[PDB]
Amino acid sequence: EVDARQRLKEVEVDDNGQFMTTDFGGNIEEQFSLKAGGRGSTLLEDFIFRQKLQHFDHERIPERVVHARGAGAHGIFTSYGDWSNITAASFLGAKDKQTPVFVRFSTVAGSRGSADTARDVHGFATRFYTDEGNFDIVGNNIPVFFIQDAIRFPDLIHSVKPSPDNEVPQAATAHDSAWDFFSSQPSALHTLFWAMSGNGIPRSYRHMDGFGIHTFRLVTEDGKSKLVKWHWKTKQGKAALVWEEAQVLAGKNADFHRQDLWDAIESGNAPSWELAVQLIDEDKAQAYGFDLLDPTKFLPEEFAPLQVLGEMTLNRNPMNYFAETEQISFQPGHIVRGVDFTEDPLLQGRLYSYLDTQLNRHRGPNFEQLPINRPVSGVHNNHRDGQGQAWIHKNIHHYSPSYLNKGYPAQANQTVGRGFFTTPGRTASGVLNRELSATFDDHYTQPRLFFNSLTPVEQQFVINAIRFEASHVTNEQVKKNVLEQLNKISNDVAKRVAVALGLEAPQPDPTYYHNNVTRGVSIFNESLPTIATLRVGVLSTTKGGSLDKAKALKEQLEKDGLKVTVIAEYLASGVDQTYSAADATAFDAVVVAEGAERVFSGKGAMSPLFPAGRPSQILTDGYRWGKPVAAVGSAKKALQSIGVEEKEAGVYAGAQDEVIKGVEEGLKVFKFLERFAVDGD
């Protein structure tokens, strides 16, 4: 019942019932410039104009170098038990212990203003405002990353982002430079496959799993440690769109995911995730056929099962997007007592990069003093001055060691003051090198494991995604280099992808082929645990009392927890949205109300209120994109017009009571994969 943003209330400003003022006080007006005469030039002495305009002119700050496009919200994490047996972290140190949290979801390549539903790796950054400092798990919705060394990050990001000569294409990897890098740097192949699957185009932020990706360390009070992988398990269930749907949705509504997250929290349907961890000993570093320090590899659950530690729930939206969401500054270096890093070369470089990049975004050192960045545990140190210094320090002896300050602020370590400490057992041994380990060399085995662990239709989506993006590559040799690398993962994949490009795939390379499968890498395979907050489009008409029983259909669906929108020609009594403003991409299921066949047919389907064939296009798109479709009573003729029979799965024709039962259980399936063709008939 405690507010998640309670600490931020002191900095909130209410402008209701007030006069307009300047930033230095004093009441004013700001609707007229000061002029020298009735039709005169504007005066330089006009201080009210310049102070207003100066602030407007300096509103924009630099966007994030990566993950510029994103959205977030506040929440509460609750620990299920006392985890002192495995870690000294205070936020996991007791049963029912609650910690405030802020989570920001994002894409990667796209700039600010780009579409939510573009194919990309997604961000999953979570902060724990704990009683021993801020702890951040900066992660993604895919358990492996492209590159093995952090020094290669600019090379990866330059290649995937728009071509520097024309800045094209926007928020897309479907171009020469991206697929040049994937083929030239074959370690990226694994994350490529995840990005080409359902994880590239998820339904929403709520329907994503999250991963810390890197192997971290969890340290106890006595110094003993264990290797750990972070996992966020979605309670809303995993769900993904189709690509042809995602493209249209990008233009129809670029704010799809952020508005979805916003509407969920406002409607009283706060999304939740369970924090889980894979715990293994130090001596299992190179035990399971790969190196745990390698970020391009994940650990199958068959070797180490998930151990649930707690649950996070996001229940408070921000009041100002910029001040909270845009200004927040996540860091993987934000670590607390009880946790420790590993020698993962990609992770190692991130610790520097995130702290450095805040100097560019916030244009100063004092970015942690911002309300959203502030901890709840207190800040006491000899840091002075800097740009935008918000506090006034009382200790005039800002140094250590010192007699004058009486040894305060004091030093804290493992035994005293509950201070951070590196794992005492950690050792370094060997020559100083600019090399990668020989255990990092395998780039093809896990990609094959991931591809094998998908369903036949899910395997088709990945191949169709590669076909689409690879066909945009103009350079012939680059496409040959791509098929060469795909052939090392799988010959059948390389064969099928080569068909679209009009090239001959190379002969089988059986070095890295295998028939192994792994658990829990699938999406369109498992049904959703709840259909709450899912969207239904009720296609109705203003003419002939069709809207009256469409409202009854809407009323019944809302009881089960569904978000319903009644569509008509114009905004009549009961109509939520017009056909002009309506699209199939904004719904999980399209239902044709009885008496609404007139808008699919001759006279009625060609009204000036909406574009030609708009009602018919919505139902057609919905069916082709695999959504549960329906048609009540005599509305089954609407299905007959588009050419869809009333027998096939995911199509529900009949009485009002039967349609509701069929549509609701159809939403659990979400996508019906039998409507999508597989290679070989």
Ligand X SMILES: *[C@@H]1O[C@H](CO)[C@@H](O)[C@H](O)[C@H]1NC(C)=O
Q: Which residues are catalytic?
A: 67, 140
Site of interaction with ligand HEM (CB under 6 A): 53, 57, 64-67, 70, 104, 106, 123, 125, 138-140, 145, 150, 153, 213, 295, 329-330, 346, 349-350, 353-354, 357, 361
Distance of alpha carbon 405 from alpha carbon 397, whole angstroms: 6
Phi, psi of 660 (to 5 degrees): -60, -45
Distance of alpha carbon 281 from alpha carbon 680, whole angstroms: 46
DSSP 8-state assignment for residue 319:
S
Nearer to ligand X, 49 or 420 (CB): 420
3-state secondary structure of 226: strand
The secondary structure element, H or E, covering residue 233 is: strand 225-234
Do residues 639 and 629 lie in contact, with contact meaning Cβ atoms separated by under 8 Å?
Answer: yes
Among a copy of itself, ligand X, ligand HEM, none, what does residue 681 contact (CB within 5–8 Å per kind)?
Answer: a copy of itself
Residue 352 marked ligand-binding: no
The DSSP code sequence of 567-617 is EESS--TT--EESTT--GGG-SEEEE-TT--TTTSSTTSS-TTS-TTHHHH
User: CB burial class (10 A; 0-12, 13-18, 19+) of residue 22?
Assistant: middle
Nearer to ligand HEM, 59 or 283 (CB): 59
3-state secondary structure of 99: strand
Q: Which residues contact 173 (CB under 8 A, 6 or more apart)?
A: 109, 119, 120, 160, 179, 195, 469
Nearer to ligand X, 390 or 412 (CB): 412
**Closest distance of CB 145 from ligand HEM, Å:** 4
Nearer to a copy of itself, 531 or 564 (CB): 564
Q: Which residues contact 436 (CB under 8 A, 6 or more apart)?
A: 148, 149, 345
Nearer to ligand X, 520 or 561 (CB): 520
Bridge partners for 79 per DSSP:
310
b/e map of 511-543 (b: 16 or more CB within 10 Å)? ebeeeeebeebebbeeebeebebbbbbbbbbbe
Within a 10 A sphere around the Cβ of 646, how many other Cβ atoms? Answer: 13
**Closest distance of CB 149 from ligand HEM, Å:** 8
Among ligand X, a copy of itself, ligand HEM, none, what does residue 125 contact (CB within 5–8 Å per kind)?
Answer: ligand HEM
**Closest distance of CB 221 from ligand X, Å:** 12
The secondary structure element, H or E, covering residue 621 is: helix 614-624
Nearer to ligand X, 28 or 410 (CB): 410
Among ligand X, a copy of itself, ligand HEM, none, what does residue 104 contact (CB within 5–8 Å per kind)?
Answer: ligand HEM
Count of residues for the chain?
681
Nearer to a copy of itself, 2 or 428 (CB): 428
**Closest distance of CB 449 from ligand X, Å:** 8
Nearer to ligand HEM, 73 or 309 (CB): 73
β-strands 210-211, 225-234 pairing: antiparallel
At residue 87, what is the residue type? Answer: T
3-state secondary structure of 487: helix
**Chain center to CA of 59:** 26
The secondary structure element, H or E, covering residue 53 is: helix 47-57
**Closest distance of CB 384 from ligand HEM, Å:** 24
Do residues 271 and 314 lie in contact, with contact meaning Cβ atoms separated by under 8 Å?
Answer: yes
Among a copy of itself, ligand HEM, ligand X, none, what does residue 673 contact (CB within 5–8 Å per kind)?
Answer: none
Among ligand HEM, ligand X, a copy of itself, none, what does residue 90 contact (CB within 5–8 Å per kind)?
Answer: none
Q: Which of 192, 239, 144 minimizes the C-alpha distance to 469? A: 192
Two tokens, residue 595:
């008496």
Q: For the chain, state the CA radius of gyration.
A: 28
Q: Which of 229, 232, 241 minimizes the C-alpha distance to 209? A: 232
Two tokens, residue 294:
């390698």
**Closest distance of CB 194 from ligand HEM, Å:** 12
Asked whether the bond before 332 is cis by omega within 30 degrees of 0, the reply is no
Nearer to ligand X, 18 or 415 (CB): 415
Among a copy of itself, ligand HEM, ligand X, none, what does residue 1 contact (CB within 5–8 Å per kind)?
Answer: none
Site of interaction with ligand X (CB under 6 A): 289, 411, 413-416, 445, 514, 516
**Closest distance of CB 663 from ligand X, Å:** 41
Maximal CA-CA distance, the chain:
93
**Closest distance of CB 71 from a copy of itself, Å:** 7
Within 13 Å and on the Cβ side, how many CA atoms surround 612? 1
Among a copy of itself, ligand X, ligand HEM, none, what does residue 633 contact (CB within 5–8 Å per kind)?
Answer: none
Among ligand HEM, a copy of itself, ligand X, none, what does residue 139 contact (CB within 5–8 Å per kind)?
Answer: ligand HEM
Among ligand X, a copy of itself, ligand HEM, none, what does residue 138 contact (CB within 5–8 Å per kind)?
Answer: ligand HEM
**Closest distance of CB 149 from ligand X, Å:** 24
Distance of alpha carbon 651 from alpha carbon 630, whole angstroms: 5
Binding site per annotation, positions for heme: 354
Binding-site members are: 354
